Paper text:
Efficient egress by T. gondii critically relies on micronemal secretion of TgPLP1, a member of the membrane attack complex/perforin (MACPF) protein family. The domain arrangement for TgPLP1 includes a central MACPF domain that is flanked by an N-terminal domain (NTD) and a C-terminal domain (CTD). Both the NTD and CTD have membrane-binding activity, but only CTD is crucial for proper TgPLP1 function. The CTD includes the apicomplexan specific APCβ domain, which consists of 3 direct repeats with 4 highly conserved cysteines in each repeat and a C-terminal tail (CTT) that includes a basic patch.
Despite using a construct that encompassed the entire CTD, the resulting crystals contained only the APCβ domain. The TgPLP1 APCβ domain crystallized in the C121 space group with two monomers in the asymmetric unit. The structure was solved using iodine soaks and single-wavelength anomalous dispersion and subsequently refined to 1.13 Å resolution. The TgPLP1 APCβ structure shows that the β-rich repeat region is comprised of a single globular domain with internal pseudo threefold symmetry wherein each β-rich repeat forms a subdomain. Each of the three subdomains contains an internal antiparallel β-sheet and an outer β-hairpin. The inner and outer layers of each subdomain are held together, in part, by two disulfide bonds between the highly conserved cysteines. Subdomain 3 (S2C Fig blue), however, aligns less well with subdomain 1 (RMSD 3.207 Å) and subdomain 2 (RMSD 3.175 Å), with the majority of the alignment differences attributed to two loops that protrude from the “bottom” of subdomain 3. The longer of the two loops has hydrophobic character, and thus is termed the hydrophobic loop (colored cyan), whereas the shorter of the two loops has basic character, termed the basic loop (colored orange). Given the hydrophobic character of the loop at the bottom of the APCβ structure we reasoned that this loop has the potential to insert into the membrane upon binding. Thus, we conclude that the tryptophan located at the tip of the protruding hydrophobic loop is probably responsible for changes in the fluorescence spectra reported here.
Author numbering: 820 to 1085
The structure:
């Protein structure tokens, strides 16, 4: 492209966040193609860890196709893409996940030879109706050659997605990643669109390039609207919980508001 400057190129590209039954797909605006992105399959009700998956969105396509199958209503897809006129060929994406029953160890992923981290995030999870009690998110760190995610809070699976770039790419040093876990625990269906919040903040003197916020929920099929891109050049990205709870009798659905951004120096 005419601009060789990673903060500017990433800010000017269009973000798209899509929710629906998996695998699904998210489409770039007409005339644009994928630069980077991810597709998730998530299910925070059914047992086990097979229903958690992240894959990268390959560049240069008009859409990003998702992953996983719609076996129950509680299976959901969440797809995030950044679209522009052409790919940034210096970017390479990496995903990793732990095997079933190998979640007690630290997950590690490395950038391809001679590249370094632009950004990304890792998540740890557990299945079952209470499994969001073990949810965590950690950002990857710009300028490293690796990203890792460690188990915590009783989690049984780790997964991560990151973007890497040639080490000399202009402007890389101006970028910083932030991930946040906000309100989490039992959901409250009487807090009208006000069931806790997440507030992902840039460090002082930086503003948002891209990112997203999401409500994770036992019943993901009822919080599809709670998945949104983060606003360019804002100081923070915020979202409230919807206030949804399909638990029977005395049982509460669980939720977790979380997000991830890349910020750039102002
Ligand atoms: Na943008
Ligand atoms: Na579904």
């Amino acid at each position: 492209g005419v601009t060789r400057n990673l903060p500017k190129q990433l800010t000017q590209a269009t973000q798209v966040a899509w929710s629906g039954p998996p695998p699904g797909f998210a489409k770039c605006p007409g005339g644009q193609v994928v630069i980077l992105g991810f597709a998730m399959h998530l299910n925070f009700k059914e047992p086990g860890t097979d229903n958690f998956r992240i894959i990268s969105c390959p560049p240069g396509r008009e859409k990003c196709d998702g992953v996983g199958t719609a076996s129950s209503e509680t299976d959901e897809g969440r797809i995030y893409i950044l679209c522009g006129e052409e790919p940034i060929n210096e970017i390479q994406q990496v995903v990793a996940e732990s095997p079933a029953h190998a979640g007690a160890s630290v997950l590690e992923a490395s950038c391809p030879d001679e590249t370094v981290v632009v950004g990304g995030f890792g998540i740890s999870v557990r299945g079952g109706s209470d499994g969001l009690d073990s949810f965590s998110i950690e950002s990857c760190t710009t300028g490293q050659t690796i990203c890792t995610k460690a188990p915590t809070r009783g989690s049984e699976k780790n997964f991560l997605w990151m973007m890497c770039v040639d080490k000399q790419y202009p402007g890389l040093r101006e970028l910083v990643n932030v991930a946040e876990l906000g309100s989490h625990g039992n959901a409250n269906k009487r807090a009208v669109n006000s069931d806790g919040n997440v507030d992902v903040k840039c460090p002082a003197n930086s503003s948002i390039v891209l990112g997203y916020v999401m409500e994770a929920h036992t019943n993901m099929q009822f919080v599809r609207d709670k998945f949104l891109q983060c606003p360019e050049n804002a100081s923070e990205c915020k979202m409230t919980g919807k206030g949804v709870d399909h638990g029977m009798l005395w049982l509460f659905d669980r939720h977790a508001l979380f997000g991830w951004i890349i910020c750039k120096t102002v």
